[PDB]
Design a protein around this ligand. Structure first.
Ligand SMILES: COc1cc(-c2oc3cc(O)cc(O)c3c(=O)c2O)ccc1O
Length: 238
């Protein structure tokens, strides 16, 4: 992701077939002539999409121009959470399924995986970062405290940001409860709150290289969201 000072980002297309699929997804959802109510509602939860972009001298080099969801924040605290029971897609080979399950074999049980976090600490005027191995090390026993870490800012547990996140995720859950046309694998939620010196959160869906047509509820995604909501709710009792 390349952050631009105009409030947008450029996301380089992943190698094929993943990049091309993600392009196709953004093009479908944001089709100017689209009047599908499911897709019009979905736009609210995605970064705004400004089309394919390449450098003036390099039409080979393909990016998505997207809204920078952290732009309105001063000291953004950011967490990326992969959602679902399966991070492989319906056409994955045996090898690929094994590859994906082995990356985090608790995916089926927990239904989400923390990809990373960046947390502003007021006392030190600095950021604490956690990489992909942080989330992959969390179990049923440590997931609550693992998620809690994201909200430790300003000398306190930020229960305002926790509650706002639940409220925002609930709207995304409601969208999933009311569509049976897309299933999302290896997709994420990006959480942002203000770390600088209340209740102000962004939650957006990102990462769409494995979104497929469906005729059922996305049950794995729903499971993950619900479990994430339940974990966040338990953090409100701390
Ligand atoms: C502070 O820099 C970050 C920016 C982002 C970021 O990621 C995106 C990923 C997408 O697939 C689409 C996006 O629109 C964003 C985004 O806007 C963003 O700020 C994520 C983590 C970060 O540490």
């Amino acid at each position: 992701i390349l952050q631009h000072p105009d409030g947008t980002v450029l996301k380089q297309l992943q190698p094929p077939p993943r990049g091309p699929r993600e392009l196709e997804f953004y093009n479908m959802v944001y089709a100017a002539d689209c009047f599908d109510g499911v897709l019009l509602e979905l736009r609210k939860y995605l970064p705004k999409y400004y089309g394919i972009w390449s450098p003036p001298t390099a039409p080979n080099d393909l990016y998505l121009k997207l809204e920078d969801v952290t732009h309105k924040f001063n000291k953004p605290c950011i967490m990326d959470v992969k959602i679902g029971q399966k991070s492989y897609d319906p056409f994955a080979s045996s090898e690929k399924i094994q590859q994906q399950v082995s990356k985090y074999p608790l995916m089926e049980e927990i239904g989400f995986l923390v990809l990373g976090m960046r947390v502003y600490h007021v006392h030190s005027d600095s950021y604490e970062t956690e990489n992909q191995h942080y989330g992959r090390s969390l179990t049923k026993e440590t997931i609550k405290d693992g998620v809690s870490r994201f909200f430790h800012n300003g000398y306190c547990l930020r229960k305002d940001a926790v509650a706002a996140s639940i409220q925002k995720i609930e709207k995304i859950l409601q969208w999933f409860e009311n569509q049976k046309q897309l299933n999302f694998y290896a997709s994420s939620l990006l959480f942002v709150y203000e770390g600088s010196s209340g209740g102000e959160v962004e939650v957006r869906m990102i990462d769409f290289a494995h979104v497929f047509p469906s005729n059922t509820i996305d049950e794995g995604y729903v499971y993950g969201l619900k479990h994430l909501i339940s974990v966040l709710r338990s953090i409100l009792d701390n």
